Amino acid sequence: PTLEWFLSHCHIHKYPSKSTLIHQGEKAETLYYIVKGSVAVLIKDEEGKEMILSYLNQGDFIGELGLFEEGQERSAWVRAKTACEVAEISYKKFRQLIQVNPDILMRLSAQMARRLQVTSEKVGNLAFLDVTGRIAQTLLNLAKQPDAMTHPDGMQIKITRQEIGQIVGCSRETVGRILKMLEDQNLISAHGKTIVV
DNA sequence: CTTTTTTGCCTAAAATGTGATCTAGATCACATTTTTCGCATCTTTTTTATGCTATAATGTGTGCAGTCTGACGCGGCG
Ligand SMILES: Nc1ncnc2c1ncn2[C@@H]1O[C@@H]2COP(=O)(O)O[C@H]2[C@H]1O
Description:
Elements: H1 2-8, E1 13-15, E2 20-22, E3 30-36, E4 39-44, E5 50-56, E6 77-80, E7 84-90, H2 91-100, H3 103-128, H4 131-142, E8 149-151, E9 154-157, H5 164-169, H6 172-184, E10 188-191, E11 193-196
Antiparallel strand pairs: 1-7, 2-6, 3-7, 4-5, 4-6, 8-9, 9-11, 10-11
The structure holds adenosine-3',5'-cyclic-monophosphate.
It binds one DNA strand through helix 6.
GO cellular component, one term: cytosol
Keywords: Acetylation, Activator, cAMP, cAMP-binding, DNA-binding, Nucleotide-binding, Transcription, Transcription regulation
Site (Activating region 2 (AR2)): 88, 93
């Protein structure tokens, strides 16, 4: 596709785990785009505690909020989770490509709109539902993510307990307490990895 | 005999589990200021019921029918 063309003019960089791509406050001039790898986007306080806004999978764009307003600062940290294959594109050259071909936006707008779908749902559940429904509707959809293994009447996920406190942004010990109370609910069959029946 | 692949160890190391102990949150039945609403005033404002005008003026038709007609009633009509 366009991928290999653009790869000829190689901006594609390969980053290992945890090399910091984005600090916030940086200058916004370069779009990236993903070939391969997984990455977490996150934010923290002046006094240190950090928050994972989300994570992102292959095929998606980075940093898109900057192109519109010339000279913005980068909004959040985006810290490599694993080995990443990463495009890099200038806002100038990106606008050029916009004047060349906008059908790319046909695909792009869709994932953006469902980002709204999920972010509204984020703030909504933050308001309406306690930790119960919080991690309930976490694992219910964790049962649906590819890398999910089948459990005959159920589903298996082995993401054991560290990524979870990040994908929801919570303590793991409290996740413990209530995993065991959901085990008490006959909801979850879990021993590290969990069997969403 | 050499390679690589595996496991277990070294060696460094994150994630799990103690529950005891508060602490900001949210409830919760009942008094007060605001909306601007509804009917009585004004209060105009328009509109409406009523009232005069002193040279002089004296019997319609008014626009039509085109007239159906056969039988029977009924008042005449002798
Ligand atoms: N709620 C979100 N969902 C998905 N991606 C996000 C979200 N918030 C921020 N990002 C991405 O993280 C990037 C951080 O810097 P930018 O604002 O330049 O562009 C941002 C988006 O690409």
